[PDB]
Amino acid sequence: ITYTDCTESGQNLCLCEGSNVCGKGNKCILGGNQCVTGEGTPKPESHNNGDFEEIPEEYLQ
Amino acid sequence: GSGEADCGLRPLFEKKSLEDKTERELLESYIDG
């Protein structure tokens, strides 16, 4: 799990104040930025790759 | 191996008496570095 910067206001599970995560039960105010009390939404999981060569489909089943 | 298997010995390295390019770095960390 790598926590990266909050992208939208009200996201949690991301870097809000500096290199500090804004945890569950908090939400990020893209101001300075503020990590606030409140139910945020976790910045969504990034998908980093996708240029894979073909593996035998016997395994893809 | 015998009882405990032959873990952590690479065939292409330790088994051929060859060192990987940055192992030394790990080794000296121990005697300071």
Binding site: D5, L60 | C7
Partner: protein, 257 residues
């Protein structure tokens, strides 16, 4: 891996790729501990925050790989999972405390030049080797950098990367985060004034943190890439799951004798 280099063929024969079947994607790293057992991070399989909860059937294990994306035909071994095991006290509920898991292969893998297990340490190895200042080695196919300018190059390596990092004194690990650090964790990475850098990053998680014993020439798995607050930030540290400390769990699940 951030500021690492290309691994040499067979340099980390225990490195495993956790591969998503549909859509095809690299989930995380792992390690081979025997011809049937794979060690990974619990968050790679179960992480409610991202509604991540994979089954044995959602994933494949790719072993003996150098290349991130090629299908290494007479070298890599692709295996199906028989069962998964998550540590029962794994606190995803923001701690990632006890972030460990085991995967059992449907069939045992044949070892080779590019496939061979690493060693789990004993107490005296763990006592000898886990010292602040000593260096461990991290490997993976994760991101080259925390963030980059989109569509200008690729932030993912074409080949497995390796980086050597020093273990940091706990008080310092502790003072670098606002998160509550447990006994089941340790942190590694250079100090800001230290003048070197490198870290694990997205896609490297689940992977092995290894140390080599000079006395017997053996590679031992001391950690599992668990979490960090960014990748390679100054005054920030990569956090590893403390393997020695959870070996009684491992012992209990494998039930070898």
């Amino acid at each position: 891996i951030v500021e690492g280099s290309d691994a040499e063929i067979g340099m980390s024969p225990w490195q495993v790729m956790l591969f998503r079947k549909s859509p095809q994607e690299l989930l995380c790293g792992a390690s081979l501990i025997s011809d049937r057992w794979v060690l990974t991070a619990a968050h790679c399989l179960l992480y409610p925050p991202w509604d991540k909860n994979f089954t044995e059937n959602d994933l494949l294990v790719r072993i003996g790989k150098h290349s991130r994306t090629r299908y290494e035909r007479n070298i890599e071994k692709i295996s199906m999972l028989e069962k998964i095991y998550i540590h029962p006290r794994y606190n995803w509920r923001e701690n990632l405390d006890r972030d460990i898991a085991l995967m059992k292969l449907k069939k045992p893998v044949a070892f080779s030049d590019y496939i061979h297990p690493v060693c789990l340490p004993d107490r005296e190895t763990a006592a000898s080797l886990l010292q602040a200042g000593y260096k461990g080695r991290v490997t993976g196919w994760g991101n080259l950098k925390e963030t980059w300018t989109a569509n200008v190059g690729k932030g993912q390596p074409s080949v497995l990367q390796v980086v050597n990092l020093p273990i940091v004194e706990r008080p310092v690990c502790k003072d670098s985060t606002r998160i509550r650090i447990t006994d089941n964790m340790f942190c590694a990475g250079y100090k800001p004034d230290e003048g070197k850098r490198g870290d694990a990053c997205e896609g490297d998680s689940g992977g092995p943190f290894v140390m080599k014993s000079p006395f017997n020439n053996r590679w031992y798995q001391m950690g599992i890439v668990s979490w960090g607050e960014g990748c390679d930030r100054d005054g920030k540290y990569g956090f590893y799951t403390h393997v020695f400390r959870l070996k009684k769990w491992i012992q209990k699940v494998i039930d070898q004798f």
